[PDB]
Amino acid sequence: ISRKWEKKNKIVYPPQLPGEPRRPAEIYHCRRQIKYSKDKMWYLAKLIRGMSIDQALAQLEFSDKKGAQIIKEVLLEAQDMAVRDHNVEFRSNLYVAESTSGRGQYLKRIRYHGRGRFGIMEKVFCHYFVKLVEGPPPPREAPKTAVAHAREYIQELRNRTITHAL
């Protein structure tokens, strides 16, 4: 097995010289060996990506999935650790920078079929990784506008060269 999400939270940065902008706080947390399925948890992880922690908790409270409560508990634990251990004031000033679900160690059982046949039933377990960053959430990317599209088209037209010519 691999355990590096735990160790990513134990790094220490050198003190910042005066004049340098303040470095945002990064908090890594994860829950290991969750009975809920990997792809089903990926759906919720993608759902709560990039939003504020309060908004993520609001969505997960009313989500009907079984993994919604697990993700909510993980987010609450991460918020509590960010407030207590790391020097992070304004417990509402965190946003979910990363939210991922991976697969853990499975259990193999027998699924009986009929005519004496069987199948390999696999008891799935998943890990949920979350990374929170202090600060307001970054703005969502807007769809490319007509002016930008025309600008890129004109630039690609001007980038042309006479190939196989000289």
Partner: peptide, 14 residues
């Protein structure tokens, strides 16, 4: 001939 293939069960330990 009535040829039939009896299913073979996987070992119980796995």
């Amino acid at each position: 001939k009535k040829r039939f293939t009896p299913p073979t069960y996987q070992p119980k330990y796995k």
